[PDB]
Design an enzyme around this catalytic site. Structure first.
Site, short mmCIF file in Angstrom:
data_model
loop_
_atom_site.label_atom_id
_atom_site.label_comp_id
_atom_site.label_asym_id
_atom_site.label_seq_id
_atom_site.Cartn_x
_atom_site.Cartn_y
_atom_site.Cartn_z
N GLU A 165 47.41 16.33 55.22
CA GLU A 165 48.66 16.42 53.99
C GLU A 165 50.16 15.88 54.89
O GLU A 165 50.93 16.12 54.47
CB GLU A 165 49.17 17.91 53.73
CG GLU A 165 48.09 18.54 52.79
CD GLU A 165 47.50 17.84 51.72
OE1 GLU A 165 46.09 18.30 51.22
OE2 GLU A 165 48.03 16.84 51.07
N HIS A 174 52.88 24.61 54.58
CA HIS A 174 51.82 24.68 53.47
C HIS A 174 50.93 25.74 53.54
O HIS A 174 50.20 25.64 54.70
CB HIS A 174 51.46 23.57 52.83
CG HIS A 174 50.09 23.57 52.24
ND1 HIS A 174 50.29 23.92 50.84
CD2 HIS A 174 48.82 23.16 52.32
CE1 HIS A 174 49.27 24.02 50.38
NE2 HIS A 174 48.21 23.64 51.01
N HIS A 202 48.19 28.78 51.50
CA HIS A 202 47.33 29.00 50.36
C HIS A 202 47.86 30.49 50.04
O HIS A 202 46.96 31.64 50.23
CB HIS A 202 45.86 28.80 50.57
CG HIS A 202 45.71 27.52 50.80
ND1 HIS A 202 44.24 26.95 50.80
CD2 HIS A 202 46.45 26.34 50.64
CE1 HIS A 202 44.45 25.63 50.90
NE2 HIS A 202 45.71 25.32 50.81
N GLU A 217 65.88 40.35 46.40
CA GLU A 217 66.17 39.58 47.62
C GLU A 217 65.93 37.90 47.01
O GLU A 217 66.34 37.10 47.93
CB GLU A 217 65.72 39.68 49.08
CG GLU A 217 64.59 40.46 48.67
CD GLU A 217 63.43 40.54 49.71
OE1 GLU A 217 63.71 40.84 50.95
OE2 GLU A 217 62.06 40.36 49.43
N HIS A 272 46.27 25.83 43.84
CA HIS A 272 46.19 25.56 45.33
C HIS A 272 46.93 26.22 46.22
O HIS A 272 46.63 27.10 47.22
CB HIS A 272 46.54 23.99 45.32
CG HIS A 272 46.08 23.33 46.72
ND1 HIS A 272 45.88 21.84 46.86
CD2 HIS A 272 46.09 23.83 47.87
CE1 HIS A 272 45.63 21.79 48.00
NE2 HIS A 272 46.05 23.06 48.85
ZN LIG Z 1 45.99 23.41 50.86
#
Ligand SMILES: [Zn+2]
Ligand SMILES: [Zn+2]
Ligand SMILES: [Zn+2]
Ligand SMILES: [Zn+2]
Ligand SMILES: [Zn+2]
Ligand SMILES: [Zn+2]
Ligand SMILES: [Zn+2]
Ligand SMILES: [Zn+2]
Ligand SMILES: [Zn+2]
Ligand SMILES: [Zn+2]
Ligand SMILES: [Zn+2]
Ligand SMILES: [Zn+2]
Lengths: 272, 272, 272, 272
Positions: free
Chosen positions: B116, B140, B142, B170, B211
């Site tokens: 990525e 990133h 999950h 918050e 995702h």
């Molecule tokens: Zn991912």
């Protein structure tokens, strides 16, 4: 060294240990066998202090002749492996006929390998054939959400695979062959070992409904990661279903596009 | 030192490690890049033992010319970073054209940065512009409940942001710009990197439906904390929805009052 | 010693740390103040290396004159306290007018005590009066299930208390005075500090709907245990409600019998 | 040694500690007594530094005369046992009349054994008779999902046992005698001790509705594993019920076949 400091003993500890922390291996639930090379164990041979014990196999497995494995023991708790690997794990070697095995190390105090040993050894045979010797691990755990889903989803390989693929984008790429589902069977029997091994010809993941999952892979991390991917997707699905179900999801064409991009061939029957 | 004892290596370990314990990074899921200064790595330069390897960039990124980062590797498991940082992380430096990068340290045994990487580097470019160089991290993961909510909530930036703001007081203050939602896209592509980077112009959080989430922030802790805030709110929402939905919540005027008090400007479209 | 090895520094670490592992304190969410005696800090006085900084109080609090506390800092992450207590905690002492305080130790790099300090100090004042100086701790965390229940249960002190008492047998005995519920308010304000402190006259637990809980107790363990009891009951309730609600529960007369046996006087309004 | 390094002290620490990490023992909830042999404690006798304190028993228990146990203390937190075993645990020995006991070690600062001591000692008496002295452990914890299920399932030993057997394949084999369910009772009383001990004549597991579970077994691991098996099944059930209930499950004949294969005699009333 200490054989306890070998990569494969440390490997079994990380993993039975990781499975336990996931909540997948209450009590003695679950088992983990790892196919080794003679070269792995050779440098630790003076750690074999004990007189090997021989146990015959239920059925002959010539594919596995002279093959060493490290294994979790019968009645042993995943949780305990990190506290005492020689108590809870054994190194075994299938004899030259594949008619039985010797326990070379561990499984102290008359312990023996896991009673799912047929599911394990027979599945190794099928996975070796299926992957041209790439797969080396068979892991069985009681993955909680996957278990829950077997009460609720159609126990249909195509529908179950498709839901898991939908439940996390990576799933199709990690297990494009899907998840074989067996009917419920009495565990610890040759019958269930044989049924599991047959399904391992077609899938790297096999579900035992109302019981747990079997996974196969080339390394401990990859096999654990395979099961963890399926179980994470299962966890997502359980939440979605608990919230009343999907309003949107990954489509068939998105799944197909995904498979193309990552160079896998997804189970066609799961792509309705 | 050991570069492994540097703040930024210890930083990547704490965090990939924290994300893994949260259950957000099964297998190789998720990735974490951190923008460094030359001054960070300079005192550890004799730790660079290896011949830097060059990898070209998919597209030119002159904003990032001569810029060092520390990154998680392709196919690497968050869980493993703490066990072997040089295996699982790399320090890279974008070349003077921003046309490619050299791996200076880590990513041993021919490993390479995360696949990525486009989403990462392109998003860094947009976040640097958007924050006048304040943001240094792209993470990133999950995040489980946020993933689940993408099956169930309208995949509409305004409605999704508003639910997350409602799900913990918050939230509006931590992410007043809300959460950009992309359509589902094939991961690891330039297209998804470009779409993510566009949304990072407008939000510090970007959801990949079915995702995971991308978050940006000035430090590892703040970026992790940002995602953790959204995911905690998501966790609360999943429970509320599982219980049949809200009977009361934070009102529009309460949300507005909140934003005023904390000197932020909340996403107006989310304040219906 | 190291003041870091003192009971109260070790106490703050165990607890901010325990709250974080519970999932109750994402990012900088939550805060923990502990009232000390001069005798606690005296043996560590040569650990005070720095020039105390003075911060005025929002409103005068003469009850607290000359009183030392140890406190979590503004913007600080519970998770980090174990990694660097002097960064993340401060020892402060209210001045002889109760008009302000000096930071004696910690809160390095210009950090300051928690911005919920009014809710804390004002609640300490009320709890000292209410318990004849027995209570020494105010803990605020984002207890996940209690938060979720505020979206779903009537935000009514009697009904909410009664559900929590029903959700685990011990609850009535641990918090017979019940759980005061505030309306939603902007956090970090004098108003919310004042409202919380008023409710602390009547209950050891105060809920901030859509936000979190405040608890008071004599020791860190007992205050943490109080919140943990309420939150465990909340967790049980969330599961029960997610399953479609109770079919049986603890009755009014069972609750009454319980209170009698354990020598407490349960909140009468909660015993419909 | 350190008696703190004895197997049984290390055993109590692993387990109160494991129960706490499971989320089963908030605050002082739960208790754990372990029957020892004189031979276990003899080699550590110079660790007994203090003058034994005598506490009379509520009712005479001659079966337990001269019998040593290690026990968790009244008001003590499972979480703390690992930090200070002598504070949180005691070794006691029932006197030669079984009319009372002496505390030999631990329970420092005037602490005393758990206030569920009647449920414990009386249940040990019944389990010793029932298992011909095999069982040595009584464990009570607040197992979260089992608690939740008591609000929702018929509080009927047969139906509850049958659901738990269905919720994980291993359950019938681990607890073929099922799970006795009591009516709700005031805890800490002789009445509830007596009711629990009566049910322990028939089952190794006894549920206290809206409260928790009692389990008995030969070793700490096996007793913990027993409860963990029931609670894992309960966890699965809670998920299934939250998803709208079972569409398929283990059938009566599968359960029967299972019992036959594993040489157990399952509770017939649970096999409708
Ligand atoms: Zn991912
Ligand atoms: Zn199994
Ligand atoms: Zn040799
Ligand atoms: Zn198949
Ligand atoms: Zn140099
Ligand atoms: Zn946007
Ligand atoms: Zn708060
Ligand atoms: Zn001095
Ligand atoms: Zn009140
Ligand atoms: Zn209890
Ligand atoms: Zn002696
Ligand atoms: Zn019974």
């Amino acid at each position: 060294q200490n054989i306890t400091q070998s990569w494969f003993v440390q490997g079994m500890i990380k993993a039975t240990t990781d499975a336990w922390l996931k909540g997948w291996d209450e009590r003695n639930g679950g088992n983990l066998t790892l196919r080794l090379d003679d070269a792995d164990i050779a440098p630790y041979h003076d750690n074999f202090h004990q007189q090997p014990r021989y146990i015959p196999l239920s059925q002959p497995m010539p594919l596995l002749a002279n093959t060493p494995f490290i294994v979790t023991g019968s009645g042993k708790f995943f949780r305990n492996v990190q506290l005492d690997p020689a108590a809870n794990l054994g190194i075994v070697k299938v004899d030259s006929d594949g008619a039985g095995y010797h326990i070379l190390w561990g499984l102290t105090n008359e312990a023996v390998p896991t009673s799912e040993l047929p599911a394990h050894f027979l599945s190794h045979c099928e996975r070796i054939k299926a992957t041209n010797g790439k797969d080396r691990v068979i892991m069985h755990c009681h993955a909680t959400n996957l278990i829950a889903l077997t009460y609720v989803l159609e126990n249909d390989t195509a529908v179950f695979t498709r839901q898991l693929w939908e439940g996390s984008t990576e799933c199709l790429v990690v297990f494009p062959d899907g998840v074989g589902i067996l009917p419920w069977m009495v565990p610890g029997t040759d019958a269930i070992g044989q049924a599991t091994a047959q399904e391992m010809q077609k899938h790297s993941l096999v579900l035992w409904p109302f019981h747990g999952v079997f996974g196969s892979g080339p390394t401990l991390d990859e096999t654990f990661g395979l099961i963890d991917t399926a179980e994470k997707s299962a966890q997502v699905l359980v939440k979605v279903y608990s919230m009343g179900g999907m309003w949107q999801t990954i489509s068939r064409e998105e799944l197909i596009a995904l498979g193309k991009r990552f160079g896998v061939t997804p189970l066609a029957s799961a792509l309705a």
